Amino acid sequence: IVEGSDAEIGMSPWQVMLFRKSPQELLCGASLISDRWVLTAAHCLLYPPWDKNFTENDLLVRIGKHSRTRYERNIEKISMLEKIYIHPRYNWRENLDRDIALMKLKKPVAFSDYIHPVCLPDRETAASLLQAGYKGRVTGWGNLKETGQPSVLQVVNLPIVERPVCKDSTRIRITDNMFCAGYKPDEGKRGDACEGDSGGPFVMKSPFNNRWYQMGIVSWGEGCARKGKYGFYTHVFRLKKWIQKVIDQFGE
């Protein structure tokens, strides 16, 4: 996270760190959506361009963490991957359209003050919360600037951007399955996701029921917090029909 602050304790009980077995390291970030499933971006698990095609027997998931590097005994929880599901129409060859994937945990994970599931929006909730101007939240142990690292989870609030504005900040092709956020060049403000925040959750709390909803997945960017450039996220709700498909079918 570029230009953030340290996550307050338990502030994001749904944040999940994607960990590599060997060599031990941080691959990406993700979110907890129930004791058995975790959500993340699809290029964190598969990306031919870099010869990436991880198998469940290659990585673990650390839930309820705060310290990036320390093993947080009696707080965080490490679970093993049962099975991995990547959206079938995930286009990595071009613009990472449908950058999303689901992780089925080997065994349920006990909730606590540091581990709790985030809500997924509904057509209605998405309808009234997903609007330019409104701010959302992004969390992770990703880089602080382009090119050190955070010692503790980082938090940042960002305002969503209008379709046109997002469209015109890049040469890359934007699809409806994605939206962008970030402060405008002249709003005179800085902040963004960065290396390692991938899969990260972009959330907002409905002022109606006071609950937090994950509206998007930290998907891709062109640098971190560059003027004129915006950060892109996987439009969660627009793909929830698929999520529900794999979940209710393959156990829940």
Binding site: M11, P117, C119, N157, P207
Partner: peptide
């Protein structure tokens, strides 16, 4: 039916350092 409800804040009837900013972006 308990989601998006944090044990250390909502359930505890407390807010974090900046959730205000968010809630304020709606109002305008």
């Amino acid at each position: 039916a308990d989601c998006g409800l944090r044990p250390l804040f909502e359930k505890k009837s407390l807010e974090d350092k900046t959730e205000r900013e968010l809630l304020e972006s709606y109002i305008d």
